[PDB]
């Protein structure tokens, strides 16, 4: 039986750029790097970067990766990414602040204020089409 | 600013099979579902499934999602997924026990024993090509 998320690994075509983006823009700590990848850490999250050169980027789908952020930091984080001219892939329309941006390989990322608890509560008050709770 | 991983969202072509796999094989608790998706939870991990029928899978790269498990549970877990005919995509060569497997849509998943510290420790003693610590 599984206990939670151990790590997340993303394929990256340009390793230096992906390190500079997650380290500098997003603030992960770089723990180690090597010719074929990097290990970085954001709080308790362990991020692997796996260098993969013919990597074309993801399928045009909704598969994506959301990081946490407290309510009072959200505005400045979004401004900071816009100031760095990071492209957005979707506009917000659900409970809680969300900023949706792309990484250097077009992986789909998200800064979100809220958690599963807050989502359910709100969904309880205003449920999605054909919604059912446990 | 960012605090960790808030949630993971996977596009899935067949919402009930995906829920059956995450809930019944992987041990995620189904917390809600609706027309276009489901919310599930594993410990502190918040997994969203986004119903997407014209989905043809993730492309053929090393992008994958590792879940934690105790040493002592790792054997029974692999045995069970294999008994159910899950497909493996990789043989474990790095530090710690790992079992690499695909979900019904072909998302690469992993059950892993260890963590970033156990790995850095191994890496100091057996460094990858070009390896550099922080
Ligand atoms: Mn999201
Ligand atoms: Mn892995």
UniProtKB/Swiss-Prot annotation, chains A, B:
UniProt-listed SUPFAM superfamilies: Glyoxalase/Bleomycin resistance protein/Dihydroxybiphenyl dioxygenase
Name of protein: Glutathione transferase FosA
Residues at which a divalent metal cation binds: 41
GO cellular component: cytoplasm
Compartments (UniProt record): Cytoplasm
Role played: Metalloglutathione transferase which confers resistance to fosfomycin by catalyzing the addition of glutathione to fosfomycin.
Catalytic activity line of the entry: RX + glutathione = an S-substituted glutathione + a halide anion + H(+)
Main location: cytoplasm
Positions contributing to Mn(2+) binding: 7, 64, 110
Quaternary structure, from the entry: Homodimer.
Active site residues per record: 110 (proton donor/acceptor)
Biological process, per Gene Ontology: response to antibiotic
Family the entry assigns: Belongs to the fosfomycin resistance protein family.
Activity regulation remarks: Requires the monovalent cation K(+) for optimal activity.
Top enzyme class: transferase
Residue stretches making up the VOC domain: 4-114
Alphabetized UniProt keyword annotations: Antibiotic resistance, Cytoplasm, Manganese, Metal-binding, Potassium, Transferase, Zinc
Co-factor requirement: Mn(2+)
Pfam families linked to this entry: Glyoxalase (PF00903)
């Amino acid at each position: 039986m599984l206990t939670g998320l151990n790590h997340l690994t993303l394929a990256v075509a340009d390793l230096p750029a992906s390190i500079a983006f997650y380290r500098d823009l997003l603030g992960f700590r770089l723990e180690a790097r090597w010719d074929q990848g990097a290990y970085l850490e954001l709080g308790s999250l362990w991020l692997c970067l796996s260098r993969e050169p013919q990597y074309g980027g993801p399928a045009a789908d909704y598969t994506h990766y959301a990081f946490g952020i407290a309510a009072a930091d959200f505005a400045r984080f979004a401004a900071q990414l816009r100031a760095h001219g990071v492209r957005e892939w979707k506009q917000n329309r659900s409970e809680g602040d969300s900023f949706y941006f792309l990484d250097p390989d077009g992986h789909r990322l998200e800064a979100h204020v809220g958690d599963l608890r807050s989502r359910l509560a709100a969904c309880r008050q205003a449920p999605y089409a054909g919604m059912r709770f446990a």
